[PDB]
């Protein structure tokens, strides 16, 4: 029951996320999908792995809302991505923090989200589970990549689409320091915590070559 | 031609899809004018009493008191024993009671029987 | 100076009170604080007794 | 500690490993616990010494109350209110003491579960068996009296149970 | 009350009501805090069919995936001492049947 | 708590070199960390133990007799 | 998976049920039938209190790995070798499980072949 | 918002409102500005081809097919300005709006601070007191018999008069009081 | 926020800026009091387009009932000032 | 302390359709007999620091150059140190 | 027990010999001192009881109710001080006399070693409440309300008297100790069934039972603030106390006879919680919430298990305090707006922030937020019901959900949103009202520290 509930939750929420226009709504649906993945991990009888995912998701999703709130504040309480244009250069620290957070969320080798999500996917593939739940978990991973690139593409890449009077400003040490602490977290915390905790499960040492790559391929 | 929107109780018809607004008549226009007249008279009375500097209290609203009185105190004198009313009252006021009585009685008879055969496994059941 | 007084009124005093309360009142009753019985591995020696746990069965080490 | 009896609340001899530093790099735990000792444990210890000397200056005692045994509800006539009162009070006191016994055994079980860690399922069979026996006896005594319980209702329940036992034994004998 | 005009200068802007106008019998049912009847981009029946259809399909496919699980080409995991008999439940006075693990 | 940056009205906003250098530094740090881990620990992604081929195992070590012995 | 396709789309009796494996005697294949060897005893494997699901034939390497981690607390990265030894033993265990699966599959193939050959002979 | 509503919307007003709604929803669909400009010029052209129709029945058969087509393709999640009735900051600052009469309940120690403000407030109150007596008579004489027909108010006619019912429009709290 | 407290001068300049960037009007003949229908010969569709441009350039929406009776740049500026409560 | 610098607007003649996607929009509009009147109102979005864009992958590879240089220097130094 | 009864009696000559402008001060001070003295009854025993004399005895079920009764009078006086300002000295003295007589009758009722004495005082409490409702109520419905509050009660209470005397004609005594010690089973007979009904229905009507609850909304809505406070806090608990006392002679017939009342309460809690969601009057909503909570208490008493009795005692105390606080908040709003319609005065948080905090805490305790004693009683009753039958969990959880829904609906409607524009007479909250609110709420959050004081004799 837990496995099926997590699978349907993560699929449905990623599906809703890939089409939203409010940036906070997209990040909230991302949070719901990650929670569904966590309970999938619980349903495959891997609780310590779910706890590790909780710890990593804390870092990078908190920083993702950091960046979203910075963008909203700079653009005069505007939360729609249709009115957010070229911010890659207009505000660069939010840009780099959001790129790093998206990379950690989608699962990038040797970042904070990798040490949890990669093991989640490997454990789901190497278990006696539902075929449908496994399929939906993989599709949810792909849709996670999809809504991450949706946010980046519509918020940072194109031409500006905000009102003519530009009040963009990141130069406040409070915002910069608060974001950069979680940034260092989202870069190194996965490695540090994974190498510091004692082993609490038997690992999957041998896998088919394609089935070890499945997470990166779908992402 | 495009697929047609079908209104429902909880998803009503849009104003711009209402055929009545496209069917105009002088009687319709005078009806709208006199509706606006009633609304304007009420608005004028309210604002005259609202902007008054001497007024130092709640502006009495007859509509609100009519609503509350109809909701509370106008019900029973306007009640009649009717087949609809009688059947609805009997059902909604008796059926749940007997349904829950049947459910709980069956559950407790099953529990009592299982205790009689001793096949309940009441171990560690200390607090009741 | 502000940090020095903050670390005294907000860290040192609460830890003093809590340490006193735990060491002299909570630990007074049995089973109030229960630890984990730390892990014992072959080759370890114990402070209380001094005896040394024997090693393992010398499994073949190759690769 | 002497503040409680070790036999009522037993503990294993608490074997602990010895530090075996395989590297020369200083572990922050040792230095940090030493500075904790210096900055926290000594002032608390000195305050306790002050309080304990002040307590030692004024020493006085309190006693645990002893209750005599009185005839129980079985040695009471059907309407003799005074003996029934005595027996009911005694039965209520015994019921409270039995509750405390069950509490002690449950505390033992909880301590075992926390202490044995990952091997509690095997290393707590003793406490589980003790709690099972005590729980069965307590249930046989007091399971179904409900609110408005009394010594008379407990006696009736015991009589019914032991009538059933006598019938079962007689059926087994005449099988 | 939600679908009443929000640009009108109501005497009760939050409730969107005027002073003397008659109050609906179920005003407290429709207060923008509760059920609203605003027209939707998609018809109610279409949404109901789509929501029901999606839920039914997911439910059906989860049952199917229970029927046909996914696993790896492996045998059962093996545990040394009589399938860890004494560490799982115990009863060391029974001497259970020995289970022997095959070397391959 | 920051610096004084005036509105611009239809040009590119004013940028301090501090934020640019910090953003570039942290992006470069992230990429360097990824490269360093991949160089030192490649098997965390690629795997360390080759997957055996069940069809390549001979009938001898699996205890298969040619259909007549047992 | 490829095995799933041959068990769901092909013949169910052609391949094992993973729940009931094995369905044949162990010493059926060859009469040697060597035993599996365990290094960690009851008591030390209890005292390390690893996990119930970590208490397998690979336990000794986990013991060594745990000890190495404990002694070198500050240098977490230092005990690289212990981890490799443990995952190699787990790899060998998984390979043995795969060998059991393939062995039982081949035995099922040979049993079906023997029964069909016998049926052909009897009908002839 | 400010302007009093009429009894009905004329055909031209309906067409203009449909034009604005369709353009806004097309902007929601066409995110980029160049694509939006192209499709908006096309949309304006498609409005313009029936600008000169003289048949009212024809024009009313039109705008109806048009609003049906709009409802079919209306972008179920259109862009809304943050302060608009559907925006994400619509009634954000209503909890900060305090009525002006609350200042009458302040303690004298509170009014000791800000003495100039309360002196000017007293002046405003006196002005309101006199202007109200003038306003009631002016509204009574200017209103048509049988009651008002439209909720539109007249301006001041004489020199010292103030617009009738002005106090609660002039003394609004603020758009963002805090 | 850190949004400057915009004044009447800024609103007037910005409205005239948007209007001079509308190429159906020649900027040199444009003035604050010039009527849209008669002084510049614009259609009501042009007027609603101008209202949309003002909305998109000031970041807020003018309702249809108020927008459909704004025919001069000066009264557009006055409407914006009343909505935003500008002092000078 | 607030932003009181008396900001002055840029010249309105500065904005042109030339050299922007608004140019090709105007071209395709002229192919069917229409014109875009609000084109210059949007030229500022393609003019200044907004004129140059970056790709999605280029956005992903924001600091690959100097990080890669640090990587190669570090690996070379480690190779030189361990070969001793 | 006379050391509490005599000062309460002396409250009367002190009130009638007071100055015209000192009645409230003297009454409040001496009622507070009587409450402080009564607070020493909480030192109860694990054994039988505090048997003071042949007439009065104390129990750890009676002691919390006695302390709450003594504590309620000063709060009632503080609440009544405002709306009685324009009234003559003799009539205010009469009002205070009615309150003092109600307290005296309640105090003697809760000790009342005799069942006939308990009945006499339990019915003597009727007169002061009826006079308070039908004399100092505002609307024209008060008279009608009084009639209901009268006859319902007597319709239940007259058979009980007959049953009571019948018991003494057979048993020979009606002393509660002798009854408890000499109790005997009731055979399944028609005569015994009707004796059971005569014993139960009188206490059922005043809980009130779901089908028999019509009098409560009228009586609580049309009563003045002191009347509503005393009705919700203490007078509703007389039925629960009487049932807890009288169910000792009704075994084992309670097992069969409890089913219709159990079904009525379990369904009526859902019905009344749902009724609260659609209510246009604050007082009526609070009254229906009281009906739901007392339905839960009825279930607890009918199950008659130790956890049931502990939960019922805790819930009775917690509900008394919470409902008195809620009625006081509603009356503070009413004395400003004079309407008692929930939708009229809106957005009062922006004008009365501290009163908004009081509203929030009262709604939180009504919502049964842990570790409040409201939730302690709720959870104990729910666990006992689950042991009684596992299917009760659906109804109990639904009731919890609807309770949270209507409590937060009440809070949001009155405190949040936008203020009503035409209402300009919302004056700043007085020190008297804030003190009243704190004196309601601090005892609750302070009782959550020592729950065994309100868990009854089966703790
Ligand atoms: C959490 C740890 C706290 C430790 C610090 C000690 C705090 C002591 C508080 C004692 C009770 C407060 C008295 C109630 C009336 C409030 C007085 C007032 O008006 O404030 C004026 C004062 C001045 O403000 P102002 O600007 O003049 O007024 C502006 C407006 O009023 C606007 O004012 P506002 O917007 O700021 O709102 C006022 C505030 C205050 O108003 C309240 O709502 C307070 C009442 C909330 C409880 C509701 C009933 C539910 C049952 C809970 C019972 C817990 C009691 C425990 C025993 C208490 C002993 C008496 O309300 C809130 O902020 C909402 C908080 C929601 C909390 C819900 C969580 C409850 C469970 C938490 C854990 C409890 C058990 C822990 C067990 C494990 C750990 C040991 O404001 C304050 O001082 C705030 C009060 C402190 C906040 C209380 C929140 C947690 C405290 C819980 C009770 C004690 C916990 C014990 C555990 C310790 C470890
Ligand atoms: C404004 C912002 C906050 C500022 C203030 C900060 C300080 C907060 C600290 C206070 C709240 C935090 C909770 C911590 C509680 C500490 C005290 C507590 O531990 O003592 C309790 C003791 O208090 C009492 O138990 C509860 C008080 C009883 C309440 C009686 C009500 C008063 C009468 C009013 C009339 C009654 C009306 C209601 C009728 C029912 C429980 O102690 P207990 O372990 O158990 O035994 C006592 C000591 N022994 C061992 C010697 C026996
Ligand atoms: C309205 C708002 C709420 C008010 C209070 C409502 C609560 C009152 C409910 C009364 C409780 C139960 C009353 C009788 C219970 C007896 C058990 C009976 O129901 O079961 C059968 C009883 O059979 C039939 O009921 C016989 C009587 C039939 C006539 C009763 C009238 C039926 C409907 C009347 C309800 C009206 C209630 C209000 C009256 C004003 C079993 O038959 P049997 O095992 O052989 O005999 C059992 C009794 N013995 C052992 C003593 C002999
Ligand atoms: C069970 C629930 C039974 C039905 C409860 C009815 C409650 C009625 C009273 C609620 C008060 C009114 C109200 O809530 O208003 C609706 C309010 C506002 O609507 P918005 O969409 O937010 O509008 C915002 C823009 N205007 O929305 C709500 O909160 C309604 C919520 C109702 C929930 C009902 C559906 C729940 C079904 C859950 C089934 C699945 C259970 C989970 C399975 C777990 C397995 C491990
Ligand atoms: C809120 C309004 C409710 C109104 C009252 C509801 C309670 C009704 C309970 C019954 C009332 C009278 C019962 C008698 C009091 C107890 C006395 C008793 O138990 O003695 C019985 C006597 O039993 C009776 O006489 C009972 C007769 C009842 C007659 C009145 C009937 C009233 C209505 C009956 C139907 C409804 C019953 C339950 C209604 C519940 C409330 C809705 C046996 O004694 P003996 O006969 O001397 O010994 C046996 C050998 N001869
Ligand atoms: C992308 C979302 C969906 C979009 C689909 C919607 C489809 C809409 C296209 C329908 C075509 C029409 O114009 S529908 C035809 C409606 N009828 C008329 O146009 C008759 C006379 N025209 C007027 O009166 C106008 O107001 C005018 C004179 C232009 C200005 O007036 P001013 O001088 O007073 O500004």
């Amino acid at each position: 029951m837990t496995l099926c509930l997590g699978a349907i939750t993560t699929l449905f929420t990623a599906l809703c996320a890939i089409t939203q226009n409010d940036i906070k709504k997209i990040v909230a649906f991302s949070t719901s999908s990650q929670l569904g993945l966590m309970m999938v991990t619980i349903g495959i009888n891997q609780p310590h792995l779910a706890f590790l995912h909780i710890c990593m998701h804390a870092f990078f999703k908190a920083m993702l809302f950091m960046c979203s709130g910075s963008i909203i504040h700079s653009l005069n309480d505007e939360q729609d991505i249709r009115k957010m244009g070229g911010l890659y250069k207009a505000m660069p620290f939010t840009t780099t923090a959001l790129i790093i957070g998206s990379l950690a969320l989608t699962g990038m080798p040797y970042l904070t989200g990798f040490y949890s999500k990669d093991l989640i996917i490997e454990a789901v593939n190497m278990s006696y589970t539902n075929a449908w739940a496994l399929l939906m978990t993989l599709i949810a991973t792909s849709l996670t990549a999809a809504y991450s690139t949706r946010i980046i593409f519509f918020a940072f890449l194109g031409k500006p689409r905000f009102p003519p009077l530009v009040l963009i400003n990141e130069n406040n040490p409070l915002l910069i320091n608060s974001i950069k602490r979680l940034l260092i977290g989202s870069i190194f915390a996965g490695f540090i915590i994974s190498n510091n905790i004692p082993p609490m499960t038997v690992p999957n040492t041998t896998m088919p070559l394609y089935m070890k790559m499945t997470a990166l391929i779908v992402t | 031609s495009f697929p047609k929107y079908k209104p429902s109780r909880l998803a009503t018809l849009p104003a711009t899809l209402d055929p009545a607004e496209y069917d105009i008549s002088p009687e319709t226009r005078k009806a709208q004018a006199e509706r606006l007249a009633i609304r304007s008279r009420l608005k004028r009375e309210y604002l005259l009493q609202y902007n008054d500097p001497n007024r130092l209290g709640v502006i009495e609203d007859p509509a609100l008191i009519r609503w509350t009185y109809a909701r509370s105190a106008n019900i029973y004198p306007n009640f009649r024993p009717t087949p609809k009313t009688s059947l609805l009252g009997a059902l909604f006021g008796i059926g749940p009671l007997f349904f829950w009585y049947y459910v709980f009685k069956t559950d407790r008879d099953k529990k009592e029987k299982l205790i009689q055969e001793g096949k309940l496994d009441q171990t560690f059941n200390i607090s009741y | 100076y502000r940090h020095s007084i903050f670390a005294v009124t907000h860290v040192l005093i609460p830890v003093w009170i809590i340490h006193y309360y735990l060491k002299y009142h909570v630990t007074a009753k049995p089973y109030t604080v229960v630890e984990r019985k730390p892990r014992i591995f072959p080759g370890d020696t114990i402070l209380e007794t001094g005896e040394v746990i024997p090693l393992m069965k010398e499994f073949p080490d190759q690769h | 500690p002497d503040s409680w009896d070790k036999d009522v609340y037993p503990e294993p001899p608490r074997r602990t490993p010895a530090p075996a530093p395989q590297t020369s790099l200083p572990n922050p735990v040792t230095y940090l616990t030493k500075i904790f000792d210096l900055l926290v444990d000594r002032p608390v210890t000195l305050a306790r010494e002050f309080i304990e000397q002040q307590h030692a200056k004024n020493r006085y005692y309190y006693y645990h109350r002893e209750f005599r045994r009185v005839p129980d509800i079985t040695e009471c006539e059907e309407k003799d209110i005074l003996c029934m009162f005595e027996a009911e009070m005694q039965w209520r006191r015994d019921y409270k003491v039995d509750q405390e016994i069950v509490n002690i055994i449950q505390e033992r079980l909880k301590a075992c579960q926390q202490r044995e860690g990952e091997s509690y399922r095997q290393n707590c069979a003793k406490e589980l068996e003790q709690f099972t026996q005590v729980s069965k006896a307590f249930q046989d005594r007091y399971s179904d009296l409900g609110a408005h319980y009394s010594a008379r209702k407990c006696l009736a329940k015991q009589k019914q149970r032991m009538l059933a036992e006598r019938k079962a034994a007689k059926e087994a004998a005449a099988a | 009350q939600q679908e009443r005009d929000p640009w009108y200068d109501w005497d009760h802007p939050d409730l969107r009501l005027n002073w003397g106008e008659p109050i609906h019998w179920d005003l407290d049912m429709y207060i923008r805090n509760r059920v609203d009847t605003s027209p939707t981009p998609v018809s109610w029946n279409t949404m109901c069919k789509h929501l029901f259809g999606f839920v039914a399909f997911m439910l059906f496919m989860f049952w199917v995936g229970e029927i046909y699980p996914s696993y790896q080409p492996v045998g059962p995991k093996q545990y040394p001492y009589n399938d860890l008999y004494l560490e799982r439940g115990g009863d060391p006075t029974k001497e259970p049947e020995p289970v022997v693990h095959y070397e391959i | 708590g920051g610096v004084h940056i005036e509105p611009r009205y239809r040009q590119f906003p004013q940028l301090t070199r501090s934020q640019l250098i910090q953003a570039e530094f942290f992006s470069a740090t992230m990429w360097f960390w990824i490269l360093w881990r991949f160089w030192h620990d490649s098997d965390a992604v690629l795997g360390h133990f080759p997957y055996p081929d069940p069809s390549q195992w001979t009938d001898e070590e699996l205890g298969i007799l040619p259909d007549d012995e047992d | 998976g490829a095995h799933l396709a041959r068990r769901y789309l092909g013949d169910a009796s052609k391949e094992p049920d993973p729940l009931r494996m094995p369905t044949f005697p162990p010493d059926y294949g060859f009469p040697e039938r060597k035993e599996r060897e365990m290094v960690a005893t009851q008591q030390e494997m209890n005292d390390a209190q690893l996990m119930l699901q970590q208490r397998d034939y690979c336990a000794h390497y986990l013991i060594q790995l745990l000890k190495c981690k404990r002694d070198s607390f500050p240098n977490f990265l230092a005990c690289k070798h212990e981890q490799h030894d443990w995952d190699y033993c787990e790899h060998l265990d998984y390979v043995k499980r795969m060998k059991e699966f393939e062995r039982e599959r081949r035995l099922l193939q040979r049993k079906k072949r023997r029964e069909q050959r016998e049926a052909e002979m009897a009908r002839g | 918002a400010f302007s009093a509503p009429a009894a009905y919307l004329t055909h031209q007003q309906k067409v203009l409102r449909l034009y604005k709604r369709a353009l806004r929803h097309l902007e929601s669909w066409c995110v980029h500005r160049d694509k939006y400009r192209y499709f908006a010029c096309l949309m304006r052209a498609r409005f313009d081809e029936h600008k000169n129709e003289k048949d009212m029945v024809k024009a009313t058969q039109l705008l109806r097919q048009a609003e049906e087509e709009f409802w079919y393709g209306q972008h179920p999640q259109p862009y809304i300005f943050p302060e608009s009735p559907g925006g994400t900051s619509y009634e954000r600052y209503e909890c900060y709006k305090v009525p002006e009469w609350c200042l009458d309940d302040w303690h004298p120690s509170e009014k000791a601070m800000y003495p100039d403000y309360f002196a000017k407030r007293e002046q405003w109150k006196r002005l309101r007191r006199e202007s109200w007596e003038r306003e009631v008579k002016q509204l009574q004489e200017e209103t048509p018999p049988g009651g008002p027909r439209t909720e539109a108010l007249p301006p001041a006619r004489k020199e010292g008069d103030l617009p009738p019912l002005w106090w609660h429009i002039v003394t609004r709290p603020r758009e963002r009081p805090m | 926020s850190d949004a400057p407290p915009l004044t009447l001068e800024a609103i007037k300049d910005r409205v005239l800026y948007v209007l001079k960037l509308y190429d159906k009007i020649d900027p040199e003949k444009l003035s604050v009091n010039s009527h849209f229908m008669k002084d510049l010969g614009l259609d009501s569709l042009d007027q609603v387009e101008i209202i949309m441009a003002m909305e998109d350039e000031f970041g807020f929406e003018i309702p249809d009932i108020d927008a459909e009776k704004l025919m001069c740049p000066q009264e557009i500026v006055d409407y914006i000032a009343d909505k935003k409560d500008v002092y000078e | 302390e607030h932003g009181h610098s008396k900001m002055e607007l840029p010249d309105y003649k500065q904005w042109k359709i030339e050299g922007t996607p608004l140019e090709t929009v105007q071209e395709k509009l002229a192919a069917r007999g229409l014109r875009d009147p609000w084109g210059r109102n949007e030229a500022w979005r393609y003019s200044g620091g907004f004129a140059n864009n970056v790709s999605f992958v280029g956005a992903l590879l924001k600091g690959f150059k100097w990080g890669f240089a640090a990587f190669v220097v570090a690996v070379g130094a480690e190779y030189y140190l361990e070969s001793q | 027990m006379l050391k509490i009864i005599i000062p309460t009696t002396m409250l009367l000559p002190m009130t009638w010999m007071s100055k015209h402008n000192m009645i409230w001060i003297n009454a409040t001070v001496h009622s507070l001192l009587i409450s402080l003295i009564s607070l020493s009854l909480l030192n109860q025993l694990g054994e039988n009881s505090l048997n003071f004399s042949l007439t009065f005895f104390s129990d750890s079920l009676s002691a919390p109710l006695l302390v709450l009764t003594t504590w309620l009078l000063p709060l009632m006086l503080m609440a009544s001080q405002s709306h009685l300002s324009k009234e003559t000295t003799t009539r205010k003295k009469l009002y205070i006399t009615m309150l003092i007589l109600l307290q005296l009758f309640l105090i003697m009722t809760f000790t009342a070693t005799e069942l006939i004495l308990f009945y006499i005082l339990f019915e003597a409490t009727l007169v002061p409440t009826l006079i308070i409702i039908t004399r100092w109520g505002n609307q024209t419905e008060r008279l009608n309300a009084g009639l209901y509050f009268l006859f319902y009660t007597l319709a239940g209470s007259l058979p009980l008297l007959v049953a009571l005397v019948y018991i003494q004609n057979t048993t020979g005594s009606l002393n509660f100790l002798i009854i408890h010690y000499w109790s005997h089973p009731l055979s399944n007979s028609w005569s015994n069934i009707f004796m059971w009904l005569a014993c139960i229905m009188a206490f059922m009507v005043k809980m009130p039972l779901y089908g028999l609850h019509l009098w409560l909304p009228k009586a609580h809505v049309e009563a003045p603030i002191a009347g509503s406070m005393v009705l919700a806090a203490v007078l509703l608990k007389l039925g629960g106390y009487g049932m807890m006392r009288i169910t000792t002679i009704l075994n084992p017939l309670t097992n069969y006879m409890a089913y219709p009342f159990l079904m009525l309460s379990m369904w009526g809690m859902i019905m009344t919680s749902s009724i609260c969601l659609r209510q246009t009057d604050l007082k009526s909503l609070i009254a229906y919430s009281s009906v739901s909570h007392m339905a839960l208490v009825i279930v607890a008493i009918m199950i008659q298990t130790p956890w049931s009795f502990m939960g019922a005692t805790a819930l009775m105390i917690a509900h008394g305090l919470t409902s008195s606080m809620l009625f006081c908040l509603a009356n503070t709003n009413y004395e400003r707006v004079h309407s008692r319609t929930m939708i009229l005065a809106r957005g009062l948080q922006t004008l009365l922030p501290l009163m908004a905090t009081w509203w929030l805490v009262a709604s939180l305790t009504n919502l049964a937020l842990p570790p409040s004693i409201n939730l302690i009683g709720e959870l104990f009753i729910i666990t006992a019901s689950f042991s009684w039958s596992n299917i009760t969990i659906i109804l109990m959880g639904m009731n919890m959900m609807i309770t949270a829904l209507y409590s937060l609906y009440m809070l949001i409607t009155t405190q949040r949103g936008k203020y009503t524009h035409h209402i300009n007479n919302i004056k700043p909250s007085f020190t008297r009202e804030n003190a009243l609110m704190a004196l309601h709420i601090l005892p609750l959050l302070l009782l959550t520290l020592n729950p065994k004081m309100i868990l009854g004799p089966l703790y």
Side-chain angles (χ1 to χ4, degrees), chain K residues 35 39 42 64 67-68 71 317 321 443 446-447 449-450 452 454:
Chain K
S35 196
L39 200 58
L42 285 179
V67 176
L68 179 72
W71 176 253
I317 305 295
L321 275 170
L446 197 76
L447 275 174
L449 276 173
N450 211 348
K452 72 166 172 293
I454 62 175

Side-chain angles (χ1 to χ4, degrees), chain H residues 11-12 43 46-47 50-51 62-63 66 73, chain I residues 43 45:
Chain H
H11 179 94
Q12 288 69 240
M43 188 67 203
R46 166 187 178 183
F47 283 94
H50 309 108
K51 175 173 69 70
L62 299 179
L63 181 64
Chain I
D43 168 8
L45 296 179

Side-chain angles (χ1 to χ4, degrees), chain K residues 194-213:
Chain K
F194 281 101
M195 205 206 70
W196 195 97
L197 274 178
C199 282
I200 296 298
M201 291 300 326
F203 309 116
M204 277 281 167
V205 66
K206 316 174 73 73
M207 294 299 291
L209 188 60
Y210 167 58
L212 297 174
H213 76 295

Side-chain angles (χ1 to χ4, degrees), chain C residues 12 15-16 19-20 23-25 27-31 34-40 44-48 51 53, chain D residues 3-4 9-11 14-18 36 39-41 43-45 48 51 107-108 111 114-118:
Chain C
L12 208 50
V15 72
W16 276 340
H19 188 73
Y20 177 93
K23 170 185 219 206
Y24 294 129
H25 290 95
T27 300
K29 281 86 73 183
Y31 295 159
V34 191
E35 293 179 353
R36 177 65 191 280
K37 181 176 72 71
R39 293 180 181 177
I40 302 308
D44 287 330
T45 186
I46 297 89
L47 276 297
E48 288 96 7
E51 62 92 17
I53 309 298
Chain D
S3 63
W4 40 277
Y9 308 99
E11 292 207 312
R14 181 66 178 172
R15 324 188 307 164
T16 187
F36 168 90
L39 268 296
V40 186
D41 201 348
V44 163
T45 297
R48 188 56 174 170
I51 301 299
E107 289 171 0
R108 278 192 197 176
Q114 167 61 27
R115 180 199 305 112
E116 316 295 338
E118 197 68 35

Side-chain angles (χ1 to χ4, degrees), chain K residues 11 14-15 18 22-36 70-81 96 99-100 103 432 435-436 439:
Chain K
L11 278 173
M14 183 278 288
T15 305
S18 299
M22 296 267 111
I23 50 169
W24 301 114
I25 295 181
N26 301 330
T28 307
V29 165
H30 286 142
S31 61
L32 278 158
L33 287 183
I34 289 175
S35 196
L36 173 72
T70 55
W71 176 253
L72 206 73
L73 185 72
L75 314 186
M76 283 154 60
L77 297 160
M78 302 171 216
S80 306
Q81 284 183 31
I96 301 176
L99 303 186
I100 293 162
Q103 183 178 2
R432 178 185 49 82
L436 189 58
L439 288 172

